Structure formats: C-alpha cells, structure tokens
Amino acid sequence: RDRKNMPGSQREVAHAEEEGVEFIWQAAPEGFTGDTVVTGVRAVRIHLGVADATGRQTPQVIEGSEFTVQADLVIKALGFEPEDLPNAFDEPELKVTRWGTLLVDHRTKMTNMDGVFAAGDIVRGASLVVWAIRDGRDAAEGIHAYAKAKAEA
C-alpha cells in the first residue's frame, strides 16, 4: 500500500529510515527464485484507485512493471489469526464468528456457555495493549458480579 496507510505508528517508520532501512511502497510479492535456498524475490508493482464512496481503495496490479530483488533471507510477516479453540479445548459448543473471534455480550463479557468468560485480544483481533487492558478490567468486573450473584443465591 502507500505510506500514509501504514497500520502501525509513524515514529518507528522515521526511526527505521534514519537507522538505514530502505522502503519499497506499493509492491506485492509474486515468486521466489532459487534452487533449494531462496536466491531472489520476484515482485510486482500495484496501483491504488481513488477512494470509493464507502472509503475503500481497490488496488490493481500494473501489467508492465515487474521486478526482482536480490534476497538472501526473507521473513514472512503478513498477519495473525485465531486458532480453532472449540475443536482444541474439547468443547464444541463455544460460539465463534467466521474469522475465529468468539462471540461475547457487551455488558457482562460472558461467553456463550455458562460460567466461562473470554475477553482480551482473541475477541477483537490485531489490537494494541491498552485495548487488552481495558477488556481485561471489564471482564474482571463482570466475573466478580457474576460470582457474587451466584454465591448470593
């Protein structure tokens, strides 16, 4: 993508630039040339359309310009996704969305099943630390309320 749509902050980008990194914006990988160890990365150059009426740019790969960079060691850092929790925690009744983030109510932060709660990063996605802290505090309050109400009667 472009520079202004970087998902992280922008002070670290300037820091990396000052430290010696070289950046290549709006490029997509196509293949890896080598025999048994990677020797180079063949990539393309894409072009972004104007922002849509809903605020979403649709990129399209340019037909002419495709290049190759010499690479000794490449590191795939695309992203992260939740695991398959119900089929690994032995409980196939935990309600899940499509991507893997389980469903939860807004107030009590209670999972579909009784007694179990879930809040943090597995419910949001690729968030930051402070969001996790807030979710933890809210889930703590909800668990306290539920336990008090249960031992109450």
Binding site: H47, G49, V50, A53
Partner: protein
C-alpha cells in the same frame, strides 16, 4: 404537447401504473396553448388495459352470468343532435356484430361532467357510449381480435354508406381501452370519473396531449390512436397515400380470407397523418408481424456505408427499405401491440425521448424527464433515444430489450443475408456492356434546330451549363427576381416554369444537407412493387440504380437488361391535326399505355424521339402526368415502371418536377449532346468527356438533394409521385384531371393555350431558317430578350428625382412605371369608389404616414458598413424603424453620434446561425424579429463567400477570417410550434420591453400556420413575397421558389379573421413595393405596415449590377474592399426624400379616393375590381379567391391592443424580489430554491436586470449564485451573463445554456444517488446553442447536437450523442466518453479532446474538415489538466478524479481534434 408511456417490466397488472399515468398527464400544462377561457383545450387522451373485474361486476349486477373468458368493450361516439342517427347507428352496430355469432351483453352510458368544457368544444360534443360484447364460441384470443377488427372495419364502411355523419369508434378490442376527449390535460380525471375507481388496474399505459394550429376542435381527431401514439408531425403523406393506392391492388393474406375484400380502401377520408399511419400500422400488425418489425418496416434506420454496425442489421435494413417506402418526418412514437410495448424515434432524431427504470420493475418514458415524481434512491438507469433507436418491453414473458439487444433479437428470425443477395446492380452491367455500338454524333444544324424548338438560348449554356461541367456545382445569382410570372409573359416559357417549389415553415424543420448527407439516399429500384404482406426471397429480386438520373450509355445498358419485355410509346402530335390535336394525342397515348401494360409489359419508355418538321413534341411533364395518373386510376401502376426520355431537360428544376410527378428514371440526351458539342470545340480546356459527364451528374444529384431537403424529405422513394409543388396559372380542370394533388387557387390557361404556344415555337424553329440561337434575357436584361421590372430609364429617373429633391420628377417616374403591360398579380386589379373626392389638405399628414414604413434587414456581411450605417441613420431621423438583419451589429454604435445621428437600429434579428446574438444585443432594441424563411431563398440559409469575411466581420461574428460561412437551413431550436412558443417565451423574458415578430414566406397553407403562431403569443406577422432581393443565392431558388405576397397576405388575413384572432396581431408585408398605388393596394388587402428594401438601395446609388457575390460592386454598396468602399456616394437625405415622396403619393391617392386615413381603408376589399387583359389573350385568371370578404362582426379589422402580450411569470420573479441588496448595494448573494419541470427559463430575467445595471462583464465570476434541487425545466439559464452561477442537483430537460453569454452552469446528480455518473444522461438535446462565453460542467452524458454553433464557450461533459460539435466555431470541448456518427461535422474553429478507451474514434469522426491526432505539446496538456481539475473541483465527480489520479498513463488515451483552416493561425503549433 407530449407523449408518454409507463410499463410494468414483469407484466403484472396494478393500479400504480394507471395512477402514475394520470399524475404524468397532470403536469404538461406549461407546453399547451393557454387560453383566456381556461376551459378550452385542444385534445388529450389515455390508453390503458381493460379492467375485466369492473365490467364483469357490472354485468353481474345487471343480472347475467359473468363468462369465463375475457370481455370485449367498444367505445363509440354517436351523434347528439338527432335521435334517428343514434337509433340508426345502434341498429347498424347490432346487425353487424350478430352476423358473426357473438353475444351482446348490452350498452352502457359513460358518466361524464360537462362542467369543465368550454363553449366551442361543447357545440360538437358527441354522445359517448360503450357496448359490451362477450365471446361464447370459445375461440382463441388471436381469432377473436381478428374478427373484432374485421367487424369494426365493416361497421365503418356500412355507416359511411348511408352518409351518416358524426359517428366514430374509439376502440373495439378485448385487450385495451381508450379514454380521450377535447378537454384540458389536468381535467381528464374530472370529465371521466370512471378512472378514479379502485378496480382500474393495468400493466401499461400510454398518454398524449396535442397542440393544434386552429381553434375549431373535432373530437374524433384526439390521440392516442388504436395501437399508436405520435408526437411530431409527418412530412410525406401526399406521396405515401398515393403509393398505398397502388399497393392495395395486390395485397392479400390467408389470415383474413374473403373478408379481405372489405379492407381494400385502407386509408379512408377525413384522417390526419397520424390517422393514416395508424391505419397502415394496424393493418400490418394484424396480419402476422410484430410491433418492432412493423416499426422497422415503416420508419427505418439510416443505412450508412460505415463499419459501425454488424452486417446483420445492414441486411435487415436493406430488406426493410426494399419492401416499403419510408414515412419520413419528425416522429416520436409510443406504440403497443397486444403483447409488445415499443417506444421509437425517426431517422433524424428530432423530438426528444427520455426514459427511466426503477427498482420496482417499472419503466417510464416520455418527452420530459421530470413528469413523474421519483426519488433517486429508486432509479437504476437513465437514458435517451438516439436517431433510429427503439426500446421494447415484452409483457408476455416480462423482459426489457434496449436498442442493440432488440436489433440482434430481430435479425435472427429470417435469413436476411442469403435473401438480399438476389439484388443486381447496374455498374456491373455497364462494365460488362462492351465499348461498341455507340451512334454517331448529331449534326450541328440538327442540334440547333432541335434546341430552338424548345426555346433554349445561349445564356442557358454559358451561365447555367458551363459551371456545372466545369466545377461540379451550380450557378449563383445575387439579386431578386423581377421577371414577369409565367402566364402574364409573352415569350415561350416552358411548362416547368408554372410549378413553384415547396418548403416548410415552423411546423416542420428543413433538413440541412451539406453536413448530414449520410442520411439522404437516392436509391432507385425497378421491379419492386408487389405484395406487402408477404415474406420470401422473391420480394428482393429487382434491379437497383444508385441515382434516378441516367446518362446515355447507362440508359442503353439498362435497355439491354430490359429488352424483350419493355414497350416504347410515342409522345408527339401532328402539327396539322387541328384545334384539338394535343388532347387527342394525350388520349391516344394514355390508351396505348394501358393496352400495352395489360399485355404483359413491365417497362414503359416514353420518348419524344420522333420529333420532326411535321410532328410537335408533347411537353414531357404533361405526358408523364397523364400516364402516371391513368395507371394509378386503372390499378396497373403496381405492375410496371416509368422511364422518360426528354429533350428539354437542362436545369436541375426539370428533373425535380419530373420525379415529383411520378417518373422513375429520367434521361436527358440533348443536354449530353450539347455538352459533347461544346467539348469538341475546345471550350473546357484539357478535361476528358467522361470527367465532364461525371461532374454534370454529380451537380445534378447535389441540386436534387437540395430541392428535396427544402421540405424535409430524406429519401427519393417517398418523394416520387407525391406532387410537392404548386401550379400558379394553370386551369383547375387540367390540374385536377392530370396531376395527382396540387392546388390552383387561380385557374389559368387550359390545353388550347399550351397547344398554341407549342405550335408557335415549333413553327418558328422549323419553318424559319435559323442560323444561331438568340442571346436571350431571363437572368440579365437584353433588348431582344424578355421584359423586366427594373430597367435603365426607370432607375435613372428615380435617382434623379431623389437627388434633385423634386416631386414632379417623382410623378414622372410613377407614370413611367405604372404604364407598362401587366407583369405581376397586382397589375390587373383596379380601384373604384362610390363617394365624392375630398381635398388634399384634409387627409393625414406625412409624419403619421411615414411612420408606417420600415426597411427590411440587410446583413453587414453583404452590405458595406457605410451603407448600413447610412440606412440606420436615415430611418431613425424621420421617426420610423430600421432593421439590422443577421450578422450582428457594432456595439460601439450603441450611442448617438455627436450630430445626434444615432447609428443604432430599432429592430434586431434572431437568425438561424445566431452569429452575434448576445445578452447586450437583445437589450439594445425596441422591437425584435424572428426570421424563419427569407423571400428569395425559402427553406435555405444565407451564404457569405470566403473572401468577403474581413477581420472586422470575423471579430463581429466570432468566426475565422477567410472562411465561407453558410447558415444552417433549420433552426435547431424550432422543430415544432411548441418549440416556437418556448422560444417566444424566452425572447419575451430576456427583454421585458420589446415585441416579437415572425417572418414567413407566402405559399399555400400559410393560413393555418399563421393561426397557429398567433396562439404562441406572437404579435407581429411579416409576409414576404417571391420577388425579394438577396446577397447570394442559387438561381433555381431565386427563380423557382415562393409565391407572390398577394396570395399569402389575403389568405392570412381571411384565416385570422375567421378564428377571431385578427384583433391581436399586426400584419406587415414587403417585396416589390415601388409606388404609392402598390402601398394602397397592399393596405386594402390587410397589411398595416410596409417594407421597401431594394428601392432604398437604388436611392443610395445601386444600379442593379447583380454582382454582389463577387465583392466587386462598382458603386460600393455591397462591398468589403477599401478601393471600392472609397467610391460610396450615399446620403441619408436621399432616402428621406424617397420616403417623403412615397408617403405623399399615398396621400394623393387617398384624397382622390374619398377617405382621410389609412384606417378607413384597411381590409376594405370591396374597393378592388378585376379587369382582364382583353379578348385576345384568354387567360382565365379568377382572383375572386383573392377578393373574398370575411365579415369580422364585433371586432375591428386591425390591431386594437396596447403593448405586447405579457406571459406568466416563472421562478425568476421571486428571485427579483429576493436579490434586492444586489441591485441596491451591489453585494454578494446566495439563494436556494426548489426547481420543477413546469418552470421554464430559470435565471433569464435576472440576467436582463444585471445587464441593464452593470453590463455583461461588470461583475466578478460567482457574484450571485443559486442552488436548485430537482429536475429543472427547459432553457435553463438561457442568455446568462458573467456574475451568475446556477447549480442544479438533478438534471436538465433541454436547451440548457442556450446562448450562454458569460455565465456559469453546473449540473450534477444528487449526493445520495446510486448511479454511475458516466453512464446516465443528465442533459437533453441542443446544449449550448450559439454561446459566446461562459463555462458549463456536467456530470453525465448529453443528447444530440451537443454544442452546435459554439463560439466562445467552454464545456466539460462525461459523454455525448450523435451530431456532436456540429458546425462549431470557437472554444474548447472535453468529452470523457463515447460519441456518435457525423461528429465534428462542419467544424471550422476551436479545438476538441476525446477520451478513447474503445479506440473507435476514427470510425465515428467526420474526417472532412478536421484532423485528429494525439497530444504532443505540453502547452496543450496544461490546458486539459486544468480543465479536468476545474471539473473535479466543481462537480466533485469520481470518474474525472480517477482520470486525474492516473494522469501519466491516461494522457496517451486522448485524441485532439483541430480544424483544417486553423493550421496556419494557431500560435503554438500542434506539430514538432
């Protein structure tokens, strides 16, 4: 005025379509003819489906049983005044329905309310009833419909048999019903309360409202019709009816059976064009074809020789054009079969048609895009209909076919490509024809003897024959026609001089031909006529020629192909036959033709080849007329063709009248012999003979196309045998007997006079020993030649009387001019009173009479600035009015000179080109004038040679120096009377103090046109004659077009008096006015003001040199030189003295007559008598049609109202009441309103106030801005000046930005619109017509004729239609999309940029006068970049924004179009 149709796409009945139809009808009241009564309409109607449940519940209530099948309901108009007519018609209907076996359920009287109808629409109100017929035989639907149609036809015939009047049938079918009447559009649901019911649900609806030219309504004449609805007005019906009269005698189909016999006269009597077309359409549909196929067969597409359509459509169009003659004319059609619903357009695409699809499966189409209220959150696609396009909806399966999909689906039914290959051409045949067998040339003496026999002079060969073979074009003359009319002349005038041509006033637009020459065809087919209700390969097996005119070699090759089936006919009569030889010869030839056609012949060749010293030649026109009429009347014209060999054909007016009479091909061999004889003497130089013949044929075809285009006909097949001429001076008997359809309002010579003339000339040529041809005078004065109106002595004596300032000299002039033998119509009448004379000092003074004279318009392109200024100064000195004519005027002359001599002009013209029309040009006059047609060249545009355009004129007209300027024949703003009313409203809004004058040309049928324009709030009518001068015109249009004003003036007067409309308008006449007697006669005829014209030019120094087009006038009147302008001798006192003498002559004649004022004599026709030339000439001219006196009654015989006729106020009024700080403090403003389609010319009156206050360029851009939300009306922001900014959210209808004068208009869709801005039409047709400055940004596609006659404007639009940038002159235009055929045609200045993804511009552009390349200069790149950035800034578009994002790779997708004349004059050259 308008058509409209609503359809449910899926095909399920519902009340929604009907209620939306009523709503759409309730909002067309602005285009109609508003009346002081408020109840009188001119016709309205709706056409819907049959509400089965309604009538079934009615029948149940009556007491019968509701049947299982569908019902049939017939609506009838019975007479109201009698009670036997009602009973007789009921009896006829009942014995005619029961003869088939169906069951009649009963009659029903429709509930009505007569509270809303006026008087004159109520005196002829018929009795409306309905008859309910049920089907008990259990037949299918198609059979039931067929028997219903047959029953309707037989009932009509039976009722007509008893001559029972006032009877009509509005529908009789099981599928649809029609509610129509003579009420206003909005009062339809009040007269017919039935439509207010809850059970009237349908799946389709058609609605129509008309705009009639007269004020006598007839109820059976209101649309929609049964299976048709028409807007526009058809040209060729006098030719199509005649061809249907020949097609009827062979058509037959097994679907009808024996009953076919009772449909033989398919086109009855008492129908309009929209009735005959409807009848033919219904007959062709009921026999097997579908509505799209019939629409293609009757109104076809324009078959062009380009690669922009698949060959399938080309083969289909070839078949359709081969089987039937088209029905040309402006036509927007909305028709419906029992299954299909079609909306279509004609060939040229003149009327507008816009449609819309909503998410409810609902399509709404009509003439305006804002009739039905619909939110943009419901739309799917907006569109339009180009030339020849159509859109269809299939209700049985519920589908929607656009243009291309319908074409592909229609070109699959039959193998058209394999069928068309049966056609055979003639160039193949003439090439296989060996170069052998050519006969030897005729002798010189024989050629001269044959030429003398027809009266051909050497001036017919050096003036009108040499330019044809030398150049490829026709001759040119530059002065009016002062020759005597044919009957009053004394030499041998050929029979082709008695036929004046036709043209079209406001009711129809003439077809320009120098630019849209691609839609005009001259195809001719022999062996064509046959059964029109068939489909097989034998229907397209014929011979095809590329032009109706044939040479000698081509004629011999075609005679080879014909051969053993053709029959030749003699066309000569013995000179010694006696007093009745010509009639006997006519009888003999018209009997032999019939006896030979019945014998198996299929080709008739009518030759005068045996003309000798004892056999005179029958005039070819009379022969072909008699033969064609007899063949039509004997049911044999459908079998053969008609080929004519003539020896008199030398001018392009001969072939026109011959093909108009009915001939198929014409061969002129004497002209070719003369060409060859002139070539062998070494007169053409070094060109071969074949090149000369090719040039001659090309010139003939171009002139034929010109003559055919004056009326509006674009195909020769529908023009042939229609008789689009008028005979002036022929006997009523001769014309009504031998010619199909022509009117002779004054009868003339019969057959004896023609025989005498022919025999006299033949004897003079063959018994008198000729040695050379006479020089002859017909275009130039010659002593041996013919007489003329302007001779030498008259001119000298007039100039002397004017320059010496003496009256007795002027009376000597009058005595000289009023003593020649009769030469015009006004020479035979005689003044005769019965009162006693009164003294000279008692009549009106010279001032009150001189203020009745004006001078007509004479452009500055023709005249010199000095003469124009002299006329303007002289006419303003005596208090009268002058005229500026076309070509604009000098702004610096807008203030009085220092001698007080004001050089301004009190009358400004709105020409067809709008060459200088701006906002200041219309606010610096007292009295306006619309020019529809000129006296000399009717149905044609003014010309200006390429060397007459100096730098001053180029700056004054905003054009290119050294370029020929030819005005467009049509107006592009006036396509029908409703557009004329719109333009008159525009003109009355832009100038709140002036009057509007309409200028017509005298001809037959002008009375109805005058009664129509008088309802459009016009207050002065001007009737010009045929003898008016001009600056440059072809000789054929000068000598053979128009009629004397004596006819038209009297016709207009009588028709206006008949309709109680004379007391609202004034009448003005001009053309050939020389003396006081002429003015008194014209005043008796009905006129009130008078124009002089050419006589003024003689008073200033012009001596009739007739070399105005050469730019070498010796005196220097019509000149643009300096050498010659220095020789001017004019002075205003000369013109003042001329007018003084002319007025005091009228005083003299009035005082001798017995009156004291011109108001005492106007209209008093009974003071005129007719005396004929004597018992030695015997012309039977009866001018009684000219002297008929229609009694006014209560009203006077002239105008009696004060000031102009004000019009209702638009939204502008409120704006003027709101933007007061702008006019008092002069501060910035910002307004917001809601627009609607019932509001015309938004922002024009404000522009007038701004112009009067600050001027055109006094305010900074964007000083006052207005924001409109909604579909606006027509003429949005017309004549807007700089400092005004209109912003519309929605769309505009038509004529948006007409005549922009520096303003700024922006049109964009709403922000909540789910529409692709580059795929939906936002503005209509004729955008930016004649604009000189400003900017216009739109976010959609435009209609047809986008940016015509642009002069200084700048426009950025996301699309275009056909004929875009036609005849543009200046400015820049950026089109980010596709274009149509004939793009940039006639472009002569400016620049264009097209954005091409399809790489298909070289297929659409007209590479004739413009060049197209790719951008190679950064200077021209900054221009485009800034223009698109401004577009993105204003309209906030998304297409243009994404183009600006990817600039580096899209800059190479643009084509730059630059005119050819602008290749030296560009300042940063386009090349490297």
């Amino acid at each position: 005025c308008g058509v409209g149709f609503i359809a449910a796409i899926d095909g399920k009945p519902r009340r929604s379509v009907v209620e939306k139809g009523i709503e759409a009808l309730k909002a067309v009241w602005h285009r109609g003819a508003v009346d002081a009564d408020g109840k009188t309409g001119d016709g309205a109607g709706i056409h819907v489906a049959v509400p089965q449940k309604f009538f079934k519940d009615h029948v149940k209530v009556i007491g019968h049983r509701a049947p299982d099948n569908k019902l049939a309901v017939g609506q009838v108009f019975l007479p109201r005044i009698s009670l036997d007519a009602q009973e007789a018609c009921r009896c006829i209907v009942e014995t005619e329905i029961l003869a088939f076996g169906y069951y009649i359920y009963g009659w029903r009287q429709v509930p009505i309310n007569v509270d809303i109808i006026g008087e004159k629409a109520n005196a002829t109100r018929p009795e409306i009833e309905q008859i309910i017929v049920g089907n008990n035989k259990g037949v299918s639907d198609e059979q039931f419909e067929l028997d219903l149609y047959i029953i309707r036809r037989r009932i009509e015939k039976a009722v007509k048999g008893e001559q029972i009047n006032d009877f009509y049938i509005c529908s009789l079918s099981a599928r649809s019903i029609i509610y129509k009447g003579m009420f206003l559009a909005e009062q339809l649901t009040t007269f017919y309360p039935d439509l207010l019911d809850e059970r009237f649900e349908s799946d389709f609806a058609i609605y129509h409202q008309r705009y009639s030219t007269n004020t006598f309504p007839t109820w059976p004449l209101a649309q929609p019709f049964r299976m048709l609805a028409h807007n526009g007005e058809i040209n060729t019906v006098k030719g199509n009816v005649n061809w249907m009269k020949a097609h009827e005698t062979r058509m037959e189909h097994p679907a009808f059976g024996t009953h076919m016999q009772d449909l033989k006269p398919v086109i009855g009597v008492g129908l309009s064009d929209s009735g005959s077309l409807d009848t033919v359409f219904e007959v062709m549909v009921r026999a097997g074809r579908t509505a799209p196929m019939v629409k293609m067969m009757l109104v076809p597409q324009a078959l062009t020789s380009s690669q922009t359509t698949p060959d399938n459509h080309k083969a289909l169009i070839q078949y359709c054009n081969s089987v039937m003659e088209p029905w040309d004319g402006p036509a927007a059609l909305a028709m419906t079969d029992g299954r299909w619903v079609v909306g279509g357009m004609d060939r040229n695409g003149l009327r507008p048609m816009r449609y819309t699809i909503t998410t409810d499966g609902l399509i709404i189409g009509g003439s305006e895009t804002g009739m039905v209220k619909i939110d943009e959150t419901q739309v799917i696609e907006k569109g339009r209909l180009g030339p020849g396009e159509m859109i269809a909806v299939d209700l049985q399966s519920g589908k929607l076919y656009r243009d291309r999909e319908l074409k592909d689906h229609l070109a699959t039914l039959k193998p058209w490509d394999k069928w068309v290959q049966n056609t055979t051409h003639l160039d193949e045949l003439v090439k296989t024809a060996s170069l052998k067998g050519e006969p030897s040339d005729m002798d010189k003496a024989e050629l001269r003897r044959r030429q003398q026999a027809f009266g051909l002079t050497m001036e017919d060969m050096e003036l009108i024959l040499h330019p044809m073979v030398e150049d490829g074009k026709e001759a040119i003359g530059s002065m009016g026609d002062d020759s005597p009319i044919a009957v009053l002349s004394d030499k041998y005038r050929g029979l082709h001089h008695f036929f004046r041509q036709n043209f079209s006033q406001v009711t129809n637009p003439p077809i320009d031909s120098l630019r849209e020459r691609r839609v005009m065809s001259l195809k001719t087919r022999l062996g064509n006529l046959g059964n029109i209700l068939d489909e097989d390969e034998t229907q397209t097996r014929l011979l095809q020629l590329e032009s109706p005119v044939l040479t000698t070699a081509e004629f011999r090759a075609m005679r080879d192909y014909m051969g053993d089936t053709a029959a030749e006919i003699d066309a000569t009569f013995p000179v010694d036959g006696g007093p009745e030889a010509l009639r006997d010869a006519l009888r003999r030839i018209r009997q032999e033709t019939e006896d030979a056609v019945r014998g198996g012949a299929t080709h008739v060749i009518l030759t005068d080849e045996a003309m000798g010293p004892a056999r005179a030649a029958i005039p070819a026109i009379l022969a072909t007329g008699a033969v064609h009429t007899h063949l039509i009347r004997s049911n044999l014209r459908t079998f053969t063709s008609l080929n004519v060999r003539t020896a008199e054909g030398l001018d392009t007016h001969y072939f026109a009248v011959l093909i108009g009479v009915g001939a198929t091909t014409v061969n002129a061999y004497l002209a070719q012999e003369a060409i060859a004889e002139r070539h062998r003497r070494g007169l053409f130089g070094s060109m071969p003979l074949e090149k000369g013949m090719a040039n001659y044929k090309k010139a003939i075809d171009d002139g034929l196309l010109k003559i055919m285009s004056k009326m509006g006909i674009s195909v020769i097949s529908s023009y042939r045998g229609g008789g689009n001429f008028e005979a002036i001076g022929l006997s009523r008997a001769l014309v009504a007997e031998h010619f199909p359809a022509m009117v002779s309002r004054i009868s003339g010579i019969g057959l004896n006079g023609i025989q005498k003339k022919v025999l006299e000339q033949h004897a003079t040529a063959y018994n008198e020993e000729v040695v050379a041809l006479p020089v002859g005078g017909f275009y130039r004065f010659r002593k041996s030649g013919d007489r003329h109106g302007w001779e030498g002595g008259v001119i000298h004596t007039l100039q002397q009387a004017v320059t010496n300032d003496s009256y007795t000299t002027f009376k000597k002039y009058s005595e000289q001019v009023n003593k020649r033998p009769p030469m015009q119509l006004r020479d035979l009448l005689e003044l005769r009173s019965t009162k006693a004379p009164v003294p000279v000092d008692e009549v009106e003074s010279i001032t009150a009479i001189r203020k009745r004279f004006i001078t007509p318009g004479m452009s500055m392109g023709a005249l010199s600035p000095e003469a124009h200024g002299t006329l303007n100064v002289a006419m303003n000195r005596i208090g009268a009015k002058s005229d500026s004519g076309e070509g604009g005027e000098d702004p610096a002359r807008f203030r009085p000179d220092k001698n007080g001599d004001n050089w301004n002009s009190a009358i400004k013209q709105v020409a067809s080109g709008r060459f200088g029309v701006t906002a200041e040009y219309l606010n610096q006059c007292r009295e306006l004038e619309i020019k529809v047609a000129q006296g000399a060249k009717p149905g044609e545009g003014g010309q200006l040679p390429g060397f007459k355009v100096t730098e001053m004129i180029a700056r004054l007209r905003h054009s290119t120096p050294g370029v020929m300027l030819i005005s467009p024949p049509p107006h592009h703003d006036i396509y029908s009377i409703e557009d004329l009313a719109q333009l008159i409203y525009d003109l009355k809004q832009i100038n709140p103090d002036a009057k509007v004058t309409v200028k017509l040309v005298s001809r037959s049928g002008i009375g109805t046109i005058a009664a129509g324009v008088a309802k459009a709030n016009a207050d002065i009518i001007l009737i010009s004659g045929n003898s008016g001068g001009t600056g440059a015109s072809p000789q054929t249009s000068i000598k053979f077009a128009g009629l004397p004003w004596e006819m038209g003036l009297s016709e207009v007067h009588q028709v206006l008096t008949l309709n109680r409309l004379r007391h609202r308008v004034r009448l003005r006449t001009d053309g050939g006015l020389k003396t006081g007697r002429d003015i008194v006669i014209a005043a008796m005829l009905g006129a009130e003001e008078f124009g002089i014209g050419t006589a003024s030019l003689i008073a200033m120094g012009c001596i009739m040199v007739r070399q105005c087009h050469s730019n070498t006038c010796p005196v220097g009147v019509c000149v643009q030189d300096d050498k010659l302008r220095q020789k001017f001798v004019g002075t205003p006192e000369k013109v003042v003295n001329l007018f003084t003498f002319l007025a005091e002559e009228v005083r003299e004649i009035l005082a001798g007559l017995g009156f004291r004022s011109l108001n005492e004599v106007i209209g008093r026709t009974d003071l005129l008598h007719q005396v004929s030339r004597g018992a030695e000439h015997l012309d039977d001219l009866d001018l009684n049609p000219r002297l008929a006196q229609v009694d006014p009654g209560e009203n006077a015989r002239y105008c009696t109202l004060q000031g102009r006729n004000e019009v209702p106020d638009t939204l502008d009024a409120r704006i003027v009441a709101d933007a007061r700080p702008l006019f008092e403090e002069g501060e910035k403003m910002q307004l917001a309103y809601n627009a609607r389609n019932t509001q015309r010319a938004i922002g024009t009156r404000l522009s007038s106030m701004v112009t009067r206050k600050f001027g055109m360029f006094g305010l900074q851009p964007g000083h006052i801005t207005i924001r409109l939300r909604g579909t606006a009306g027509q003429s949005l922001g017309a004549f807007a000046v700089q400092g005004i900014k209109l912003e519309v959210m929605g769309d505009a209808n038509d004529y948006v930005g007409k005549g922009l004068s520096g303003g700024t208009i922006v049109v964009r869709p709403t922000t909540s619109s789910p529409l692709e801005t580059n795929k939906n039409t936002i503005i209509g047709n004729t955008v930016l017509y004649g604009a000189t400055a400003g900017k216009l940004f739109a976010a959609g596609q435009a209609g047809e004729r986008f940016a015509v006659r642009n002069s200084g404007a700048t426009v950025v639009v996301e699309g275009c239609g056909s004929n875009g940038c036609e005849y543009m002159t200046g400015g820049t235009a950026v089109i980010l999309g596709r274009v149509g055929d004939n793009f940039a045609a006639g472009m002569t200045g400016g620049m264009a940029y097209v954005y091409d993804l399809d790489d298909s511009l070289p297929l659409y552009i007209n590479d004739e006068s413009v060049i197209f390349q790719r951008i190679e200069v950064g200077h021209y790149e900054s221009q485009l970049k800034h223009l698109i950035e401004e577009h993105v800034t204003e309209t906030q578009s998304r297409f243009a924004a994404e183009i600006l994002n990817d600039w580096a790779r899209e800059v190479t997708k643009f084509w730059q179009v630059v005119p050819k004349e602008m290749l030296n004059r560009l300042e940063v050259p386009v090349h490297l």
